[PDB]
């Protein structure tokens, strides 16, 4: 099958350099022109650069020209985006896109999975995890909603699971927002009130960037 696999993303300082790679397989890579297209967090698609089949033509977007260099290793089936003098605005997921140009061809017909580049001097920070349990005087309905507040972490890469994944149908993951320069998210789970606190409900918060995992067992008030 056709495959484009991007790599090289990560957390980089403003002003730093980073080379993105796109490994191609399953098609005649040398016959295709290649594009880089990026997508800033919660924004749209933005074209970055183009290198033709044979490397005879190269175009750059005005936002990256003079700082980014596109190149290709056709024997190794790899596309490269060398980035220098990185700015906050370069933060995005970067897609590699194949594009062959002939009479009746279909350009832009395959996009990679993307690699994430985060340009920031913010420090990697593990999250504080706070349980969200009903208050003392809460009225008991048939179902009860619990939660976990995940506060003050960086970069934005947290996973919250309930009872090691055994509770998933009634889970809500709320998107992280920036608060005081760090990220905050929450997760809620709803279970029958006859099962909690009778049985244990635990939220597990994984933050791989800080190599941290926090398990919070929900306790009744």
């Amino acid at each position: 099958d056709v495959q484009l696999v991007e790599s090289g993303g990560g957390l980089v300082q403003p002003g730093g350099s980073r080379k993105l790679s796109c490994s191609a397989s399953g098609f005649a890579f040398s016959s295709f022109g290649m594009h880089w297209v990026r997508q800033a967090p919660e924004k749209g698609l933005e074209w970055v650069a183009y290198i033709s089949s044979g490397s005879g033509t190269i175009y750059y977007a005005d936002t990256v020209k003079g700082r980014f260099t596109i190149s290709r290793d056709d024997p190794k089936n790899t596309l490269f985006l060398q980035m220098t003098s990185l700015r906050s605005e370069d933060t995005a997921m970067y897609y590699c896109v194949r594009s062959i140009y002939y009479y009746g061809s279909s350009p832009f017909d395959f996009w990679g999975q993307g690699t994430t580049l985060t340009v920031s001097s913010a420090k990697t920070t593990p999250p504080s995890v706070y349980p969200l349990a009903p208050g003392c005087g809460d009225t008991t309905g048939s179902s009860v909603t619990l939660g976990c507040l995940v506060k003050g972490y960086f970069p934005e890469s947290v996973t919250v699971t309930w009872n090691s994944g055994s509770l998933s149908s009634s889970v809500h993951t709320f998107p992280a927002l920036l608060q005081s320069g760090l990220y905050t998210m929450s997760s809620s789970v709803t279970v029958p009130s006859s099962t909690w606190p009778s049985q244990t409900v635990t939220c597990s918060v994984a933050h791989p960037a800080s190599s941290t995992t926090v398990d919070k067992k929900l306790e009744p008030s």
């Binding site: 504080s128 208050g135 809620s188």
Partner: protein, 217 residues
Amino acid sequence: DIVMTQATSSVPVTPGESVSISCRSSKSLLHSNGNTYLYWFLQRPGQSPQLLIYRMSNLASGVPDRFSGSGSGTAFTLTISRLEAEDVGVYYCMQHLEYPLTFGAGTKLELKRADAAPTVSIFPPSSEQLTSGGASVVCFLNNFYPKDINVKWKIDGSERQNGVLNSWTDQDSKDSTYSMSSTLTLTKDEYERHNSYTCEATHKTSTSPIVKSFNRN
């Protein structure tokens, strides 16, 4: 550069109905050679963009015939005859007439369903957080439709606007509802100076808001 303009959101429509997403360009994409260099992509939630239409009207390989592309020099339409649940996502137009290649901002397509009131739950700050000097009061507004909702916070009955952060989920892939969290963040001193904390959810499903409260005793 050429500017591509799309509507931000599309009127939600139920699976099986038709929908048309429009795009327009600041300059005609009809080339002298007879081709119109307009491309349509779909990005499903959490997925990479995939080609739907190339050169305005040609269907990409593997794309169902319920998709079709049309348009003139400066205005283009992507039409879906019968909406399938997997068609939810963001639709981007792109011009390939000139470099730099430019995209529309994207049209987000979501599913329509019957209105549903939010399930509202309030949570006081955990003792753990209070040991850190902060105090977040959390209010979950779960499984409602449509997405438009309003939350008001009251402290001892008086309305509080500053310090509130709201986070909406995207449309739930299973029941097509929305959920949102509202978090009021106070210092510990400020939180312990007051007793009653309230979040009131105003949704189109009712004239009176759904009110959840706790008294710190």
